[PDB]
């Protein structure tokens, strides 16, 4: 019974796995990389090796109590495949990272509840620092 599922164990993904844990949430990290998943497990995180385009993987999880699935990888085409696999199984709330602004609409059409556009995230980070000065 996880509260958050983090797909993609690259820098953004592993950052979220830390921060949510510190807020006292139950998180499962998901990635195809043996090495990245095994290090997370070494650090005491809950992590599993899985292909996140595999619908049977989603069917093996209890998703009805999940708050959000976070699709955090940096490959748009892969993330769209992940989102479509997920959506073929469940309506679970999903927040998806998108690098290309032109692609936002297709992610929304494919069932992303929220899109995090990298350029928007970067802009806001700059703005927050500028406001601070």
* CATH topology (fold) name: Rossmann fold
Number of domains: 1
In the CATH hierarchy, what is the class?
Answer: Alpha Beta
Radius of gyration: 15 Å
Largest sheet: 6 strands, parallel
PDB class: nad(p) binding protein
Keywords: NAD(P)-binding, Exopolyphosphatase-related, mcsg, Midwest Center for Structural Genomics
Assembly: monomeric
Entry title: The Crystal Structure of the NAD(P)-binding domain of an Exopolyphosphatase-related protein from Archaeoglobus fulgidus to 1.7A
Question: Top keywords for this entry?
Answer:
133 residues; 20% strand; alpha/beta; 6 helices; 6-stranded parallel sheet
Notes on the protein architecture:
- Helices cover 47% and strands 20% of the residues.
- The chain is an alpha/beta fold and 133 residues long.
- The chain has one domain: NAD(P)-binding Rossmann-like Domain (Rossmann fold).
- Strands 3-2-1-4-5-6 form a 6-stranded parallel beta sheet.
- The chain starts with a strand and ends with a helix.
- This is RCK N-terminal domain-containing protein.
- Residues 1-117 form the RCK N-terminal domain.
